[PDB]
Design a protein around this ligand. Structure first.
Ligand SMILES: Cc1cc2nc3c(=O)[nH]c(=O)nc-3n(C[C@H](O)[C@H](O)[C@H](O)COP(=O)(O)OP(=O)(O)OC[C@H]3O[C@@H](n4cnc5c(N)ncnc54)[C@H](O)[C@@H]3O)c2cc1C
Length: 433
């Protein structure tokens, strides 16, 4: 009929799951907390979907990558929630939220009320149909966001093995999926309009490592164009991808990753919005008191650069959720909570490659170490320098110890005397803060 909970988390993804963990840690009592989710499963570590979920043998499958294993904490199975009297309400989609009345409505008519609301609704894919691309509705043109998408992609990879796959996009989705499709032995061509891959993060030299490495694996890369059409066949299945530059690629499966948008749609006009997200303070509270927003949807004060930003980082989803739960319990008990202080951190893994990045990629980049893609065990990095201070750091193929160092460089923002003593001595510069 109508259920009330003191705390309601809306969205059962990374941040919802991590928030539930912090609620338990902070001494949440049975009956107080609900987590409302549109998916059929308990919170899971979404980055595995474009990685081990799609491996040729013994792909990762739930319940193995439920949160919080992805950061090495305990696995929250559905029975973890119910053991704590945390109500995990699955297969439920909120289609209406009314903040004044503190009321949420499901597609099927159930209503939920709350005292405190944690919005963790994440992001949705941008699709090529969004802007009328010809034949974009053809079957086997596929997007990847949730585990249900992952199963369909996996089923289509099985059907089309030994086929041709086109990947549209050069973001981390494009790169990761291009790799997995080549590991499943399809003939892969990657296509994107930007001039090199990962264009919001990589510099031209970084990108040239990855693009050469991919081409050596057999993944072709076409840059500076876009798909403007798709040919199909009688059952309605994609057969071809028509490029803007007149060219045409054979295709049995197309995987698209041209970015996303935060699902703020329920709250439009009800909270302040900024840079596409829901504006939060340093404790993740919105314009409306007792309503918080975390993970992809939140636009928050980035204290280290004295800026306001919105990010799409698994690590931020985890930390922002913890911060909001600590702020809510802080408000109840009077006790002071320190301002969110996030250091941006992104990572990816494709083929047998693995890189990290920390900080801000502004200013002049300088490479160090070894960029030859023909090394069996490639290792190299890059620092970004602004105002005689290193403000960002990247590393491909670091041990785990070294990743620790660059993170420290990124935080401390150490001066640069000599560029030369920095390029011979890339990882060795780090030690001298
Ligand atoms: C395939 C893939 C790979 C990724 N890889 C990486 C990576 O390698 N590194 C990295 O740092 N980041 C990665 N990201 C981003 C990361 O996965 C995080 O999940 C994301 O940044 C945000 O987590 P979140 O809790 O805000 O949103 P999500 O985890 O998307 O969760 C939002 C939840 O809310 C539910 N929901 C939304 N609207 C409603 C509604 N109206 N009613 C009910 N439920 C609703 C959604 O279905 C979902 O379950 C990746 C993302 C994807 C999709």
């Amino acid at each position: 009929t109508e259920k009330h909970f003191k705390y309601v988390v809306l969205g059962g993804g990374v941040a919802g799951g991590y928030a539930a963990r912090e609620f338990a840690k902070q001494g949440v009592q049975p009956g107080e907390l609900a987590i409302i989710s549109r998916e059929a499963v308990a919170p899971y570590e979404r980055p595995a979907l474009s990685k081990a979920y799609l491996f040729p043998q013994n792909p990762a499958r739930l319940p193995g990558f439920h949160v919080c294993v992805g950061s090495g904490g305990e696995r929250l199975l559905p029975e973890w929630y119910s053991e704590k009297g945390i109500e995990l309400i699955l297969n439920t989609e909120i289609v209406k939220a009314d903040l004044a009345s503190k009321t949420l409505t499901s597609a099927a008519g159930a209503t939920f009320t709350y005292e405190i609301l944690l919005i963790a609704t994440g992001s949705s894919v941008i699709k090529l149909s969004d802007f009328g691309t010809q034949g974009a509705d053809s079957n086997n043109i596929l997007y990847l966001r949730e585990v249900d998408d992952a199963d369909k992609l996996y089923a289509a990879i099985q059907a089309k093995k030994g086929g041709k796959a086109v990947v549209v996009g050069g973001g981390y989705i494009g790169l990761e999926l291009s790799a997995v499709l080549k590991m499943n032995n399809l003939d892969v061509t990657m296509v994107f309009p930007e001039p090199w891959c990962m264009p919001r993060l990589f510099t031209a030299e970084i990108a040239a490592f990855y693009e050469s490495y991919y081409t050596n694996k057999g993944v072709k890369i076409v840059k500076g164009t876009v798909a403007v059409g798709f040919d199909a066949d009688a059952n309605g299945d994609v057969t071809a991808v028509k490029l803007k530059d007149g060219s045409v690629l054979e295709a049995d499966i197309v995987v698209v990753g041209v970015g996303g948008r935060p699902l703020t749609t329920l709250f439009k006009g009800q909270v302040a919005e900024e840079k596409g997200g829901i504006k939060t303070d340093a404790s993740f509270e919105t314009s409306v008191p007792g309503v918080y927003a975390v993970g992809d949807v939140a636009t928050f004060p980035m204290k280290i650069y004295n800026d306001v930003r919105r990010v799409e980082h698994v690590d931020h989803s985890r930390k922002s959720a913890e911060q909001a739960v600590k702020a809510i319990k802080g408000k109840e008990s009077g006790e002071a909570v320190p301002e969110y202080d996030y250091l941006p951190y992104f990572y990816s893994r494709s083929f047998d490659l693995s890189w990290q990045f920390y900080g801000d990629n502004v200013g002049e980049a300088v490479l160090f170490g070894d960029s030859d893609p023909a090394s069996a065990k490639p290792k190299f990095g890059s620092y970004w320098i602004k105002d005689g201070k290193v403000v960002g750091a990247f590393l491909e193929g670091g041990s785990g110890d070294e990743n620790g160092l660059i993170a420290k460089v990124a935080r401390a923002q150490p001066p640069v005397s000599s560029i030369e003593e920095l390029k011979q001595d890339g990882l060795l510069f780090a030690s001298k803060i």
